[PDB]
Amino acid sequence: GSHMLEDPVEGSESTTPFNLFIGNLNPNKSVAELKVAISELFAKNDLAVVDVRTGTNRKFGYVDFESAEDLEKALELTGLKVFGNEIKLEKPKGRDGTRGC
């Protein structure tokens, strides 16, 4: 069901290199279902969704990718429609993370 089972250790508080924020989620259904719709659409698109968290009761969720190729296809993935709602993306804080300033 939902047993992350993570070890007691801080690791950049991140699970993947490519991460961002998304919005436009069908508020008439569940945000968890909207995630699977994006994980299934990316599974048939040949993407690689590594993480997908929900945002607010059900207005927007975040998602992490597994490469620059999953992030570049994620950009062209604006043609989505989770539960009939083209999920939108966004650049949250922490844009960098591969090197540092």
Sign of torsion over alpha carbons 54, 23, 86, 96 = negative
Phi–psi pair at 40, nearest 5 degrees:
-80, -40
Q: How far apart are CA 18 and CA 8, in angstroms?
A: 23
Contacts of 71 (CB under 8 A, 6+ apart): 18, 20, 65
Q: Which domain holds residue 30?
A: 1-101
* Structure determination method: NMR
Q: How many distinct structural domains can be found in the chain?
A: 1
What is the SS3 assignment for 9-45? Answer: CCCCCCCCCEEEEEECCCCCCCHHHHHHHHHHHHHHH
**At 69, which CATH number?**
3.30.70.330
Contacts of 63 (CB under 8 A, 6+ apart): 19, 20, 22, 35, 38, 49, 51, 52, 53, 74
